[PDB]
Amino acid sequence: MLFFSFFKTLVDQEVVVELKNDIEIKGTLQSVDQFLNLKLDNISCTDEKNIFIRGSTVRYVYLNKNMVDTNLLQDATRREVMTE
């Protein structure tokens, strides 16, 4: 739930989703679900080749440094493990 919740905050920022098969795709994160299936708006791929992306296909999602509270995220995962 931690990562779901983490992405819920990223809504509206440009995120770059590297797909497992090397393909890039940059766009505006519009929505996310429990399985981290992402719906991005706008495009495009660099340098040639609005989409729903099956989470089971994403290798990376590249973020920028100042989208994330690196301290609250760390503590967020610290709370995650605690609940066991």
């Binding site: 929505s31 989409i51 729903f52 099956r54």
Partner: protein, 80 residues
């Protein structure tokens, strides 16, 4: 936001692009989906690509109805 399932329900009865795993992609009317991303299409056009010796050859196959098992779905695009 909300749920990407709701972003998909806005496309029932409407034309939808789906990219299957591999160099195949089908396009057709979105008749049904589920949580696992099992989609069912009508009047669909599958189009597979393939190289060989410096070749961008295409091949089309059509059907009136088709069920696609989630597993193979990687991307779903919708025109505007």
């Amino acid at each position: 936001m909300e749920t990407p399932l709701d972003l998909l329900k806005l496309n029932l009865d409407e034309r939808v692009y789906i990219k299957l795993r591999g160099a195949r992609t089908l396009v057709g009317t979105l008749q049904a989906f589920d949580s696992h991303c099992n989609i069912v299409l009508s009047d669909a056009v599958e189009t597979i690509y393939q190289l060989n010796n410096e070749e961008l050859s295409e091949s089309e196959r059509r059907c009136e109805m088709v069920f696609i098992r989630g597993d193979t779905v990687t991307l779903i695009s919708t025109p505007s």
